[PDB]
């Protein structure tokens, strides 16, 4: 299995919103791993900058490695970074799964209340995250 | 419709004029609102027109924005997109149709700038979220034009990419 | 005084005859494989420029066999030495040099070979300004070979990764404190202390107090006994439990921070 974990990196590089998709265990250690993965979000940020300057497409398969984790990076026209840390990859579905969370994030965009890198608070997006994660990643 | 949007936007402008005691930062409010709309205009129009495809080439992304945003917002794509060779940071997008004067506007005696600044702020938000931060200024040069000033960092990344 | 440099100059210009004698000895030697590498490195003490390339070539060819590849390894690093006296340096030879570490790492577990191979890589790529490569291979080295050698090599590779570009100090910071623990464990105190200081300064440069808060709880454990309290006090003060989502152990921790800042207030008042 893969301990899927999603994280948002904003336009101004500050993190925004996470969402676990892992099995239930080691949650106290998972707090330290959450600190770790925010740091990995910054490291991704840094690498995927030049790597997205290498390309012009939406998905950059997987960039960083830490001897157990895989880091999968998604870049948008919103230049947001959507990141998954996961022991074994599931990329083939998450390409369009990122596309669908992209569409939902657009839905939040039309909500002018949600604004530039303004941290997520709506229950709508949280329940969308729950249902989508139970769909593919958390499964 | 057109009257509803033209008016309602006019009340945005004049209510800002209420909260604002002078021309320039009134225009700044217009810019900020243009930003707050473009900040989603960008990635809406991404999927439905750009076919969810990113354009790293400043020319291609800028041209496609020129087509798309004007095609859907105000129907007619802006007439011309030009790059100034003296200053590669500073290009122009001339739109002969004034989107302010679509709703025929105030005498520019007591004031200078208008909804032109609002759509300029839209353009600026689109640029800065496309990974090309820029300064977009409405200018009454050859009618309505938007001067775009690229960050030396952004135009430098571009020039380095423009080393095939 | 002056006699030292007198005898020095005379001995150098008598060693030039001695190095000529050794050149004759090696020209006799060309007429075993170990003899070939002795030939090579002996004239490398005064560094033959092209005979470097021929020793490179011969050592590669034969030490494809004789699978004790310290011969061949050392051969290609002395080829890098040649590249130092080689303007082109056949910069792909540097790639060869990179090759050097990765395969030969696995050839023999005498890690010191990997160490100075990577160090020559470091220096020679620093003669190319493209430190990115050696940054990556040093960071892939430093995870292993120890928990101590891992630590000082973590900061070596780390600051080197930062040599190419000032920013992206992120994993720099992470592994340098996750090695500062090992530094306190088994390191000479001045180097470990410069670890702690430079790491913490790199933190403040681009602040992000979240994990810095716990590492400053470590700053406090070395401040509850040795360092200054006020730094930990203000560190936890900027975290400011409500709105920062602190945890039960974190609330107890900032109780202890109140204890330390109580010591500080009492000593001030």
Swiss-Prot record, chain A:
Annotated GO biological processes are: endoplasmic reticulum to Golgi vesicle-mediated transport; Golgi vesicle transport; spermatogenesis
* Xref: Gene3D superfamilies: 3.30.450.70
Instruction: State what this protein does.
Output: May play a role in vesicular transport from endoplasmic reticulum to Golgi. Involved in dsRNA uptake.
Q: Which Pfam families match?
A: Sedlin_N
Q: Where is the signal peptide?
A: none
Q: Which CDD domains match?
A: TRAPPC2_sedlin
Q: Where does the protein end up? A: Cytoplasm, Perinuclear region; Endoplasmic reticulum; Golgi apparatus
Q: What is the lineage of its organism?
A: Eukaryota, Metazoa, Ecdysozoa, Arthropoda, Hexapoda
Its GO CC terms are: cytoplasm; endoplasmic reticulum; nucleus; perinuclear region of cytoplasm; TRAPP complex; TRAPPII protein complex; TRAPPIII protein complex
Q: Which domain of life is it from?
A: Eukaryota
Q: Which PANTHER family match?
A: TRAFFICKING PROTEIN PARTICLE COMPLEX SUBUNIT 2
Q: List the disulfide bonds.
A: none
Q: Which UniProt keywords apply?
A: Cytoplasm, Endoplasmic reticulum, ER-Golgi transport, Golgi apparatus, Transport
Q: How does it assemble?
A: Part of the multisubunit TRAPP (transport protein particle) complex.
- Which family does the record assign? Belongs to the TRAPP small subunits family. Sedlin subfamily.
> What name does the UniProt record give this protein?
Probable trafficking protein particle complex subunit 2
